[PDB]
Design a protein around this ligand. Structure first.
Ligand code: ADP
Ligand code: ADP
Ligand code: ADP
Ligand code: ADP
Ligand code: 1T4
Ligand code: 1T4
Ligand code: 1T4
Ligand code: 1T4
Ligand code: MG
Ligand code: MG
Ligand code: MG
Ligand code: MG
Lengths: 372, 372, 372, 372
């Protein structure tokens, strides 16, 4: 025993590695694909189902299933296959000589924590494990002890206010609008230009359109007047069949849904009011140190111009006598993992593991009373 | 002129009727809903906004706003719509030939009473009006002149000690934890079983889960051991789509928040210590007659086992040489209206109305020197 | 006309009745209470002010005023209300067909006797009246014509020597230390145990602590050593809220102030030296008959052990060749009333009344040339 | 040995330092706060409980307790923590090489002095100590030997008359209305403007509103007519969350409760009649020197206009032939400490200490026969 495993099994992308590093080694999407066609040439390298990157590169013949829906592991058979591909097939590591540090989103079902610990204690047989919380590791990568997090991953966004290491769990605002729901809205409004993107392998292409051509408008109704003079707004993208598409106001009208969720028919508020309603629900004393520390994390905070849109809109809600400081690090896509690798590298942490001999005599219901 | 109107505009339910009756005629929720969708079939009975019961049955397409937050009327445009729906559209009564008796919670802002009187004196043009206090009408329905009230409505709970018709305003203990804050905590902990109830049309469903399946545990830490042997505790409820939910220890863990407000993260005491601190702040003579008369009122005192839990916990605080007598009538959900209907039916009361010719020469500031 | 009224309006208690009986009918405290709180339920048995026992059982919401301070009637509006409650509301008697026999303490202001007679001759319109002296009716209840009285009521204590029915007015020793000044000292030293008794309804409780648990130590500095071995001295009393209080050397240190008035900061001598200096201001031949007749009266002589303490301390002052005989009846709390009912029942007395036709032609200044 | 410690452990603020100085060094509130939230990041500077200023600055996550209620130490575990924070963590001094001079209010329980001496003689092990009286050091800072003090701290107010170094302890008038009871009334009447200040960390904000915007009205009913023309009376205050609040006639209605305690429902009189009743209970030959020397002390006498209101209201009680002279020094907030630092600097005082070898052979009951 020298080091520990840090697995940030997100809903859209698995980020794993070793503790003590700075960048994760195994970064691959959490996709399981079964082939949906006949396969006349039986043999010669054909498997029952593909996982990770090899299900991404063979995706014309596959139907691609994500096992994690909204931070919630729905298909426990495919999730066990992703962890099997994570340990053996990309870290080349034995599970039995490394403690693991899983994460999860807050406000998940309790059955999600119980089954992750049970799989790690007879399917892989880790020595000890620990299920952290994704948003408090985002501060702890940032070198802070106080701030509100906007951890906008692929399945869920969730605010967590921390003041000096103390979580305020009544002010956690979990929302169910993230990079899956922006992708599935971007497919819906690429139809009006003509492009029918229907399959589950075509949502892997619209996800790549979104990661290249989408930005956040600083003023939305002003940019909707710029598309009337449709000149410099349009850019192009070459599909995997060599076709080019043209995309106009759909570049910014897709990440506007983070700030006006009524485009996809949600009765909730944007991420500017969900952050502001997670500060008003805190105590009146700590609102200086929460307005001055807004930490973004996860991949959906990587649109160009989103740290300038939140600061333009929280300022319109917070009173004008104090500064709003959106803090977006450049590596904020991997920031949950980096804080996990820092956490498992501490010396004040090794009493906080959940060892197997402490597990089995106390049952898998132990993991809830060890977190929050 | 024969009779008077009695309107208990609560924060969660409007209860109105005529003076001298025994049960209110119009009992409808104080909800204003605007439609959040498009409405392609323009015409054929479509209005801009729905109030009351018709905003409850059509709530799938509406965003529902309660205009009374914590006993404080915030949206004066929509509170005017509920009174308009109260008089014309459910009592079928003209306002101009009936003096009305509004109520309110104690320790409200003074701007709340000034606007309720101003709206009644040019929007509806009532002859006279009177704004009572909700907790002293709860004794006066009970046929008492002495007692401490626990009027636990939908927005605010407040102790009001009355000794022999003399109010002790330095001992009124207003608290901000009631049936909204129990609903919003029950939505938070149904999530740990899996059920994401997010919209404002879904807090109308969790409010009905609370009114059917939640009880108060007599011993909370004993009932948490019963949920370990999870046998006779779980009951099922059928959603309006047809799904079933299996609520477990969330049945009693929701009304525990009345007795331990730190679950929703409040720095205030439970309703057993708020009652006992509202008696210690009284004079040492009258504590015989306040321990012997604990009157519950309002809707949030209707959980099965709350009159047995308050008596079990005030006894742990009060000295053991005297009896604690929680007095809970079966009609205590309507007990504020009944005492108001008795009060407007008295003969020693018709000089206490605030007539319009007395209003307009003195102004809207007259209403404060006519109460307490 | 058959019988006469006898009203011993003390400073702390009104004792009234008819002449010729042996016990007074109306024994109620001379308290007038106005309600200090608000009064939300206007009616149903609410009055501007309460007197006597109904101001005692409702005293949690009242500010209680004694209108007789140190034997001197200071509030003539409230004293008129105690007499009105005395005649109509507790004797059920008309004033106009009964001559009344008021009393008073000696050495009072002359304006006190004038106003008592002026009120009785137009407010109540009694036929005739007579203002006696309280201490000379204490011998006359005891069946003596020679003695020295220690009439220790609630406002004033005063020695009155009488030899053979001849009062010696130059040896009357009025002192201003009585049951109010012991109550207000007992409140001051119940604070050192922790108990804060502040209001004028809490002095109605400390007065009842004094009437149950206070005694007179035979040797004071010997009993202060018993409080060092704090074993059998302490007793417990139960408040009306149910809190038991512990009380040790405050039991006897409260009636020590009668014997050492420097505890409440008086430049006067105790009741043993006031009695002895009231005897050595008399003639040398009658001192054998005043030492052998020490009649006690008033309520503050009812502490257990005060006849044993006065006899132990006058003997330390009187010469050893002559005996001291403290005479304390069991009904000496009522002894001023009993002697007044004997006096009004005599046949050698009916020319001593002050009739109204003798009043009005001679003025209000007649009552002074009829007593002493 | 060169110098001595002077600790004025008040109810709302600890004022300590060394003898012989002119201003105290360690001024910090006597607050012990425990964290009430979860604490995810265990380590990195987290403690079980915070004291003093660090419990004030981190107060959003704390529940703040004052250990001294009404001059009475009600939590001996936390009071021991404030003395420990005083000696080591803000004076940086050893207890064992400095005699200390504690103070207390008059008329405290006897158990309060015994436990303060017991803690100083085994927990900190001082050489010698001395418990003074807070009001008699307020004269002795002022350079007087004759005067009456109105020492109005944070827990209690109390008058102490002194004529030429002789305390008149039967005229000491302790009251239980001070800067806590004015803060808790100011929270009650800030609610009628709309502001709910509920938590014990929000009473630390209302205490800072009181120290800025409150003044004593010279004529109360005249200023209540000024609030009808609500023009020059309102001022604004910026909360820690940057919300400005507007405050009108609550600026003077809060310190009016010092002069009319029936606003918070007390059966006591204001500080002008308590001072006047403390002078009339003294001897008639010294009332000229007490009317001419009214010394104020403690922080609650620092409202603008309180020396002009006492002089306006004692003059309406005292007879017109003798002058009233309210003497308020500008450093009267620290005046109890300054007179204590003078007292421990005298040469006629070193026989008045209570040394440990005098303590242990005589017991903890020695401290009471060494004062007054
Ligand atoms: N450069 C980018 N710009 C915009 N969105 C991105 C970018 N990169 C990734 N995303 C979105 O963020 C998601 C990945 O975020 P991540 O933090 O991995 O979420 P999770 O960890 O929950 O899987 C992807 O599904 C994608 O939709
Ligand atoms: N039978 C019940 N059991 C439990 N809770 C109830 C019941 N009836 C109503 N409630 C709760 O109490 C609230 C109604 O209280 P109510 O008396 O209407 O308050 P108000 O009239 O002051 O608004 C509802 O919001 C609901 O959450
Ligand atoms: N049994 C008792 N023991 C001790 N003190 C008593 C007792 N009864 C009455 N007192 C005190 O004496 C007072 C009553 O004396 P009382 O004869 O009524 O005087 P007066 O009639 O002149 O007012 C009461 O105020 C009470 O303090
Ligand atoms: N400048 C000020 N104006 C008005 N009130 C003040 C001011 N400063 C302090 N106070 C009040 O006085 C109290 C402090 O008085 P202090 O002398 O510290 O009392 P103690 O020392 O007995 O605790 C505080 O609680 C505060 O409410
Ligand atoms: C369940 C949980 O929230 N664990 C958790 C998350 C994050 C975090 C960051 C930094 C820490 C430092 C020291 C100790 C711990 C312990 C748990 C923990 C953390 C830390
Ligand atoms: C402002 C207010 O509290 N009014 C009020 C409340 C309740 C109540 C009950 C019974 C009453 C009987 C007679 C008169 C009044 C007057 C006001 C009033 C009441 C009553
Ligand atoms: C003023 C006065 O002291 N009158 C008084 C008191 C007591 C007393 C007792 C017995 C008496 C017998 C006969 C006559 C009188 C007259 C006055 C009188 C008394 C008597
Ligand atoms: C218990 C007590 O009141 N001690 C006390 C207070 C104040 C004071 C002032 C000045 C003094 C001068 C000389 C001696 C003493 C002794 C005690 C004392 C004082 C003084
Ligand atoms: Mg993630
Ligand atoms: Mg109600
Ligand atoms: Mg008497
Ligand atoms: Mg002080």
């Amino acid at each position: 025993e020298t080091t520990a495993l840090v697995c940030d099994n997100g809903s859209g992308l698995v980020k794993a590695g070793f503790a003590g590093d700075d960048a994760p080694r195994a970064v691959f999407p959490s996709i399981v694909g079964r082939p949906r066609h006949q396969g006349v040439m039986v043999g010669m390298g054909q498997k029952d189902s593909y996982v990770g990157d090899e299900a991404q590169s063979k995706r014309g013949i596959l139907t691609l299933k994500y096992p994690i829906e909204h931070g919630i592991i729905t298909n426990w058979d495919d999730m066990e296959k992703i962890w099997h591909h994570t340990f053996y097939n990309e870290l080349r590591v034995a599970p039995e000589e490394h403690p693991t540090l899983l994460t999860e989103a807050p406000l998940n079902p309790k059955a999600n924590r119980e089954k992750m610990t049970q799989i790690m204690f007879e399917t892989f047989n880790v020595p000890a494990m620990y299920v952290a919380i994704q948003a408090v590791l985002s501060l702890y990568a940032s070198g802070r002890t106080t701030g509100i997090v906007l951890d906008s991953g692929d399945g869920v966004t969730h605010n967590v206010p921390i003041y000096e290491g103390y979580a305020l769990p009544h002010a956690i605002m979990r929302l169910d609008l993230a990079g899956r729901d922006l992708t599935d809205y971007l497919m819906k409004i690429l139809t009006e230009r003509g492009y029918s993107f229907v399959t589950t392998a075509e949502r892997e292409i619209v996800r790549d359109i979104k990661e290249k051509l989408c930005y956040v408008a600083l003023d939305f109704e002003n940019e909707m007047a710029t598309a009337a003079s449709s000149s410099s707004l349009e850019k192009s993208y070459e599909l995997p069949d060599g076709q080019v598409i043209t995309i106009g106001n759909e570049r910014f009208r897709c990440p506007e849904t983070l700030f006006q969720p009524s485009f996809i028919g949600m009765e909730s508020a944007g991420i500017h009011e969900t952050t502001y309603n997670s500060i008003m629900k805190c105590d009146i004393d700590i609102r200086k140190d929460l307005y001055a520390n807004n930490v973004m994390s996860g991949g959906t905070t990587m649109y160009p111009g989103i740290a300038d849109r939140m600061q333009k809109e929280i300022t319109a809600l917070a009173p004008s006598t104090m500064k709003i400081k959106i803090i977006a690090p450049p590596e904020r896509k991997y920031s949950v993992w980096i804080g996990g690798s820092i956490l498992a590298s501490l010396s004040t942490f090794q009493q906080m593991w959940i060892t197997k001999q402490e597990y089995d005599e106390a049952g898998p219901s132990i993991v809830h009373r060890k977190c929050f």
